[PDB]
């Protein structure tokens, strides 16, 4: 995983944890596509970044993916992010990967859904923001390879990851 290539086009926008049920996974979010400001305004912080909780889910249907693609082709309305397990060290990375695979990856793929995280915009306090956590499904990698081949070449090895779509409305 070489960030030195990909960060030149799309650098990290957030670093913290994801949390659903009671299972957390420390992940760092690389920018992929869309409006980077969307991530800065959606992804909350205080110490570094409180765990993004999964409060909803989008069943990824072929029909849904069409609708998603429609708002994905308009970079401004959505933000595309790549969440990778951020470990302190190699061992820590393994543990985060392990937790992430079992808690988020397996769950999201089992549901065939999008982990929907509602965040409020700082000062606005309106949770009208949807971060869609899509599993490492073909759909995800296909768009990722088209949108960010630079970072894609790094995630091909760390396939156990999430594709997070920040959607306005």
């Amino acid at each position: 995983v070489d960030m030195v290539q990909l960060l030149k086009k799309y650098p990290i926008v957030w670093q913290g944890l994801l949390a659903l049920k009671n299972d957390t996974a420390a992940v760092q979010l690389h920018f992929v596509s869309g409006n980077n400001v969307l991530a800065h305004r959606s992804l909350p912080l205080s110490e570094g970044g409180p765990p993004l909780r999964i409060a909803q889910r989008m069943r990824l249907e072929a029909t849904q993916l069409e609708g998603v693609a429609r708002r994905m082709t308009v970079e401004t309305d959505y933000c595309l992010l790549l969440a990778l397990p951020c470990g302190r060290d190699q061992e820590d990375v393994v543990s985060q990967t392990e937790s992430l695979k079992a808690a988020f990856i397996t769950y999201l793929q089992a549901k065939q859904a999008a982990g929907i995280i509602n965040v409020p915009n700082p000062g606005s306090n309106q949770p009208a923001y949807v971060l869609q956590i899509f599993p490492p499904c073909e759909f995800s990698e296909s768009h990722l390879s088209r949108l960010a081949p630079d970072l894609l070449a790094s995630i091909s090895n760390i396939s156990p990851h999430l594709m997070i779509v920040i959607a306005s409305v």
């Binding site: 949390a19 659903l20 049920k21 909780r53 999964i54 409060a55 859904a113 982990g115 929907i116």
Partner: peptide, 8 residues
């Protein structure tokens, strides 16, 4: 978008 399962 349903309602998943977090901590509230």
């Amino acid at each position: 978008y349903e309602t998943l399962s977090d901590s509230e």
